[PDB]
Amino acid sequence: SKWRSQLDRFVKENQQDLAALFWGLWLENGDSQGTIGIDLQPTPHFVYCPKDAVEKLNNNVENRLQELLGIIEHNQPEIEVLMIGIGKGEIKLIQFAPEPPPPVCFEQVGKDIDGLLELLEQRMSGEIVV
Amino acid sequence: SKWRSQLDRFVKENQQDLAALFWGLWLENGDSQGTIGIDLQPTPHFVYCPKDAVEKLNNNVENRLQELLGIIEHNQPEIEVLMIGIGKGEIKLIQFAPEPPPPVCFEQVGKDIDGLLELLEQRMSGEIVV
Amino acid sequence: FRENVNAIRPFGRRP
């Protein structure tokens, strides 16, 4: 369960980059692919999590985050980032309202979602570690 | 000028103690006093923002803040810390999902509401400037 | 707005 705190510290340190990626992918997909996830195994990587899959994962007794689907539906992406971390079947909610807001974060990085994704995954590989 | 990034940095650096204060106040009051705010003037201090007050603000800004009312209604306090940052004629959403969640933060920090209020206001004093 | 919010004060260390 130590991964939850490691991921939480990574998120606190990388809010600008995560917000830029969040907004860029949202510009591409909205919620049509589901929620942005970080699957920590075999190494941390971004994945899309369809709503139906999130709900079934959360209904396991190891999770049961109360009203999670409502939290996902109510998150306002132009103000706030939401993702989920997944480690050995267990969900950790990632949510924060960054400064500047996600659309500005994305404009500051430019049109390089692929490079941002690679950078965040390379960083995560040494920063969420068993 | 600098208060947005200063507030954002203070929140990121103090998520666990802010979550502990948020949960302690939830235990005491529920939403009976309104939403917790951080008023940056004349010095940074915690306030309660009654629903009626937030409505009046939204009306006076011609509904630019309509999404804030919904964010307040739907907040899940077991998972999400919610606070209203009050700058100079400007408000900033504070919403984040800490690790561990707010009830565990309050138990683990082991400080009462008085001690959390005092330590957090001391920490903001001089670091957030309007 | 600020006129309509209410300070959250510590009870304080009462003498």
Residue numbers in the entry:
A (entry chain A), B (entry chain B): 13 to 142
C (entry chain D): 1 to 15
Quote what the paper states about this structure.
The carboxysome is a natural proteinaceous organelle for carbon fixation in cyanobacteria and chemoautotrophs. It comprises hundreds of protein homologs that self-assemble to form a polyhedral shell structure to sequester cargo enzymes, ribulose 1,5-bisphosphate carboxylase/oxygenase (Rubisco), and carbonic anhydrases. Recent studies have identified the chaperone protein CcmS, which can interact with CcmK1, facilitating β-carboxysome assembly in Syn6803. Here, we determined the structure of the chaperone protein CcmS, which has recently been identified to be involved in β-carboxysome assembly, and its interactions with β-carboxysome proteins.
